[PDB]
């Protein structure tokens, strides 16, 4: 019924997204930038 | 009929009436007919010129770094070096292809186009 | 309401839509092809005659569609399918 | 029968409903992304040859950093790089997981998908869009003051278009969400329609559509990331 | 089940297309990048030796 | 309701569609052809006459179609087919 | 109800279609012709006087189509054919 | 059924069609004329003041059609022709 | 009000829409392709044959729509889906 | 049925047509003007400042029409003319 | 009256709209892409090999929006949603 | 016949028109702006960095119009004005 | 008569308009963008790769409208607002 309406899931997804970003900002982007700059 | 003049730096090569001038400018092929509009273009580095005359055979010219100027009455082709069809040798032109030097390969390609071997 | 009245009203609306679309297509396509022809003749006057062979091929390709619509439109408003 | 919407695994907590299927799909995507990240962290080598995972991650990083440098400059906005790269990878993996064959008969002629891309749910796209919205608006506020920033956005390039300008400020998030939503939403519907054919005919339209949908998902992830970077740059000018 | 068979066949076709016409160029690109970086490393090593 | 009333309403809608399509086609096509002609004139002062020949043909291929619609519009509105 | 009510509603819809199509065609055609005129004047400042003529011809064709549509809409609405 | 209700509904639909057509024409024509003006100013900056004389004409023509529509649309809705 | 009557009226309106869209698309796309072809001939008159390859690749790719679009229209008016 | 209901349905459809036409015109005109602006900036980067003066003028003429159109939609929907 | 009759008539009109829009889009998009292809081939006879790549891409997307529409129409007329 | 039903059907048709017009405008405007951007980037590689500043202004102006329409579509379908 | 029948017919017509507009917009925008891409590749063969970035940036943009429309189409036909 009117799938366009938001829901509680909005928050949960955000949570699951943020931690991923938290990982990317910690163990992906800095090491990769370091490798690129070193090369 | 329009007056085609193949003019080189070292000398004026050829002049005479013709019925249709085909060549290949930078963007792409082009054909000039008697009352074509005024135009100034640069021929491709390995360009060829085909001057079709009335009552005579096609005139195929291998052009090196030429230019084209269609005027209100006459078409003028400028050329660092233009070689007429009868003067090409297949051997040297075909050999110049794929050479390390770009100008030599372009000149060989122009000769091949003039011959018709493409 | 007699059903034939509804049938023929729908048929008239359909024929109007057919003609409107056909006229839009024909007019715009002919305009574009004519623009090409005018530009070409401006560029190369002696190609004029030789330019009519493609132009007509375009026009006949466009105009035909128009007439096809017209034909169907006639069927819509003269022998309406499903009419009682 | 399509049953557009109708999320399964729906549960309730704290007086709020949650679409369990989309939560599960998002969690699977996050697990895949985190597994890739931790595998990279166990393979980053500035001395030896890089593995395929390192190649992929550094390709993403170079693309995003090039965009940032060409738009706003890495020094001004470094966080935009992790934000854009995580957005891109998340959306890409979410959309690409759909290619896996999981659609099956629902015992009543209604197709059912064990995994459906979370972007087909409005909650996922709204979450990403609103998060990006808040992020670059906060970045603009920090760049050019709490009071100056709204003045800058309302004024725009010409003050006369102030009523127009506000709309884009509202249209930026919505366009980001809906653009993604529909592009993935269609993927859900089309396959459902393609499920009405007999098995001996469903494969061809199904194969064609899923092959096209791989590309659709890749382009959608790229568009989302690029527009996020561009909005960040546009809100951090002067 | 029938639609499951249909979508499984479709996925088989997709995988065949990918392996036939997409995996080769991507593998070539990865090998190209790996060889380029390996050559850069070796050339750095020989430059240090020089 | 009188069935002829429904017939006439449908005929009016169809004629309106025919005129809308014809006018859109005519306006767009004539604008495009005139754009070609004006550009040709701008490039060449003295090419005017030689450009009017093809241009008119284009107009002929456009206006004609438009006017064809006119005829059928009348046939729809005045001599409505299926009227009863 | 009254048949004339249906007739007039259909006439108003048809006239609205007529004027919508006429306005679309007129606006876009005049815009295209003006684009050609402006580009030509940019290319050649002295061409203004000569350029006005073909531009006026094109605008005349476009406005003739538009005003023919206007007249036929006035016919549809003020004196509706087929009105009982 | 208060036949005036159907009259008003048809009048509102026709006015909406008129406004839609007028807006489409005005928007596209103004966009095209502005494209010409922008290109002319970009390529020949000195000709800025020279290009506005034709532009104001083009826009004028375009806008004229739009404004005409307004009036007629008002006629459709505020003083609906054919009210019983 | 026989259900078949309403069904057939809706089918005829739908088929009219089919024709309108198909004709518009076919005409305009064919005109654009023909414009490309005519410009190609004008630039270099002896490329006609060589250009007939891409041209027919375009025209068919346009007509493939039209005829396909046309097919379903014949399905609407002659064998109407969901006919009671 | 209630006359207000039919009148309101007609008003809603008319407002929908108004907004559809306004949006088509605004979108296409803005796209065309922006295309001109982008090309001009690409050719002459220094012109970025100058080309804003004409470009937005175009956006003034396009958007305004749309907004004017939008205005009347409100009149159709919130205070429906001739609503009895 | 039968609810299914009204629903099916609406479905037929909707599908007619679907393919009208789809055919317009596909035809015009293919025409524009083919115009680009024909121009490119006319300039460079050898550019054919490197032009089918983008062209067939441009067709692809433009065709998707067509066929997708087709699919949904197949739903409208053969599996009409909401059919009581 | 539950006048709310008629009002809802009219509002749905109006919203369909609103979003169809917005879609046409947005699609064509974005296509034209993208054409400008692609050509500009082709003419010189360096401009890729700067051309996005004007291009995304255009897409900003285009999209906004579309989204405004979208907003009112909600107003038409979720809180129908004059719903009684 | 069942009011849900009228609401469903209105929703189907509305969704037809939704996707008709979306199809026209997406098809024409993709065609225009592909024309730009093909012209750039033909004129600048070395830039072939560089153009694939903006081109898709354009595609992913224009198609947005279409796909967004598609979404709302579903909301109309599968989750008809105000169906009651």
Numbering used by the authors:
A (entry chain b): 22 to 60
B (entry chain H): 3 to 120
C (entry chain T), F (entry chain S), G (entry chain R), H (entry chain Q), I (entry chain L), J (entry chain P), ...: 3 to 86
D (entry chain a): 10 to 247
E (entry chain d): 1 to 50
Give the original sentences from the paper that presented this experimental model.
The membrane domain of the mycobacterial ATP synthase is embedded in the IPM, with the catalytic F1-domain of the enzyme extending into the bacterial cytoplasm and attached to the membrane domain by a central stalk and a peripheral stalk (PS). As do other ATP synthases in eubacteria, chloroplasts, and mitochondria, the enzyme couples a proton-motive force (pmf) across the IPM generated by respiration to the synthesis in the F1-domain of the enzyme of ATP from adenosine diphosphate (ADP) and phosphate by a mechanical rotary mechanism. The mycobacterial PS is made of two proteins, bδ and b′.
Extensive classification of the data for the mycobacterial ATP synthase revealed the presence of not only the three main states referred to as S1, S2, and S3 but also of substates within them. Thus, as the structures of γ-subunits are highly conserved, it appears that there is a conservation of an energetic mismatch between the two domains that is independent of symmetry. In S1, the rotor turns almost one c-subunit onward (ca. 40°) from S1a, in the direction of synthesis (anticlockwise from above) to substate S1b, which also moves the γ- and ε-subunits relative to the other states. The positions of the top of the PS suggest that the order of procession is S1a > S1b > S1e > S1d > S1c. Each nucleotide binding site in the three α-subunits and in subunit βTP is occupied by an ATP molecule with an accompanying Mg2+ ion, while the site in subunit βDP has ADP and an accompanying Mg2+ ion. During rotation through S1 in either direction, the γ-subunit approaches very close to the PS at b′Arg72, and potentially a salt bridge could form between this residue and either γAsp170 or γAsp171. Unlike the tether, which can be formed in any of S1 to S3, this feature can form only in S1, when, during rotation, the γ-subunit comes sufficiently close to the PS for a salt bridge to form.
